[PDB]
Design a protein around this ligand. Structure first.
Ligand SMILES: CC(=O)SCCNC(=O)CCNC(=O)[C@H](O)C(C)(C)COP(=O)(O)OP(=O)(O)OC[C@H]1O[C@@H](n2cnc3c(N)ncnc32)[C@H](O)[C@@H]1OP(=O)(O)O
Ligand SMILES: CC(=O)SCCNC(=O)CCNC(=O)[C@H](O)C(C)(C)COP(=O)(O)OP(=O)(O)OC[C@H]1O[C@@H](n2cnc3c(N)ncnc32)[C@H](O)[C@@H]1OP(=O)(O)O
Ligand SMILES: CC(=O)SCCNC(=O)CCNC(=O)[C@H](O)C(C)(C)COP(=O)(O)OP(=O)(O)OC[C@H]1O[C@@H](n2cnc3c(N)ncnc32)[C@H](O)[C@@H]1OP(=O)(O)O
Ligand SMILES: [Mg+2]
Ligand SMILES: [Mg+2]
Ligand SMILES: [Mg+2]
Lengths: 123, 123, 123
């Protein structure tokens, strides 16, 4: 395997929350139902959501951000141990296959009113 | 070798310095004596320290942040050329062995009142 | 191939623009003519330029930031699809050869008055 792409993204939490409040349908456009919930069942907060948005932008970047990709075809899930993970389906999986991506790595940080993600695509 | 994990962490310098001043024992809990000094012998400043804290969080993230890890079992050292490096011992080395990590890569930045680190674990 | 280095850099856009305005010769010292233009032909703006500066710092970091490297020996170019790319020549290529670097990966983000880059060197 070799590195096929890297992405980084930094989002302002306040701006992102304002985007969500302005267009009620937006959250469901960007996120699967599972992503909108905490492991317990509570609704996920805006900073954690901004970090997942940053993950999806970073993932897009690592794939060369082509047209035709759906936000709901990338999913951030969470291991029992707490590690965030990427699962790709449909349009995003198809693009990753064009490029030969076998493995995804993500990390998130959110603090200081800002959410950051890095994504590495390997294959 | 393949990538086994990635971590990113962004820390607010002011907040971190306030944490250090509030609990005198904290610095010695987070850092080895060597990390608290500049190559000359002067005491390392708060921004540079916040960046090493971010490195250790990022390293934890790349390992899936399990319980039982000691801050003093990760060490940021510095090459003659100035490159920051990671050395892992004890509990952190043990966890990296569980995952098959052979090689560590780190970079630091601190500026704008914020410290950032990225860590990649390969093996 | 394995990872040979990683770099991250975060630059304040305002500070960087002030540096450019203060010393007219600075832009031409840091950037090739091609980097100072948008694909159309318009002059590239300060935030996008700060992000390319961050890329070159990040690239320097991934190489262990030795003496003797020229800013104009690293070039950020842009694919038809929009992906940013690194090309290295002269002094920067020579240093990458010392270390065995075969492949470069970069991503950029600029938002919230700040520009960020990550660079990975593989070989
Ligand atoms: C995986 C998924 O969920 S995809 C689902 C559908 N969503 C998408 O495809 C969204 C893709 N995102 C976009 O189109 C974005 O506008 C991007 C990636 C082009 C830019 O990201 P933003 O968050 O808007 O801005 P940000 O400042 O973080 O990034 C800009 C940088 O991205 C980089 N970029 C631009 N196009 C691309 C591309 N095709 N591939 C990779 N990087 C790119 C550039 O370096 C740019 O800076 P520059 O113009 O100064 O060189
Ligand atoms: C190497 C050493 O020095 S270890 C020594 C002992 N120290 C440690 O083990 C510290 C480990 N650190 C922690 O427990 C931290 O609270 C962390 C890593 C869980 C989070 O980091 P913080 O700096 O507190 O917050 P930050 O916002 O930067 O990171 C949060 C993100 O980390 C990610 N995260 C949470 N748990 C884990 C995990 N087990 N592994 C990897 N990433 C994780 C999540 O994506 C989370 O955001 P989300 O809840 O919105 O998904
Ligand atoms: C590819 C090219 O275009 S090279 C062309 C010519 N330009 C250069 O060579 C510029 C090289 N840049 C420098 O000298 C910079 O001052 C650097 C890389 C040392 C630091 O970057 P800056 O943007 O000034 O500050 P920033 O806070 O982002 O980075 C500082 C961190 O860089 C790291 N660093 C220092 N020296 C090195 C090195 N030789 N290699 C890698 N990382 C280093 C350290 O972790 C440092 O933080 P610390 O002192 O708290 O440990
Ligand atoms: Mg952004
Ligand atoms: Mg943090
Ligand atoms: Mg900087």
């Amino acid at each position: 395997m070799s590195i096929i792409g890297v992405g980084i993204d930094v989002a302002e939490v306040e701006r992102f929350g304002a985007a969500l409040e302005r267009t009620p349908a937006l959250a469901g456009r960007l996120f699967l139902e599972s992503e909108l919930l905490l492991p317990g069942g509570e609704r996920r907060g805006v900073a954690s959501l901004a970090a997942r948005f940053a993950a999806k932008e970073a993932l897009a970047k690592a794939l060369g951000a082509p047209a035709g990709l759906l936000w709901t075809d990338a999913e951030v899930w969470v291991e029992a141990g707490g590690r965030p993970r990427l699962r790709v389906t449909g349009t995003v999986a198809a693009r990753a296959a064009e490029l030969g991506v076998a493995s995804w790595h993500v990390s998130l940080s959110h603090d200081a009113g800002i959410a950051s993600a890095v994504v590495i695509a390997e294959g």
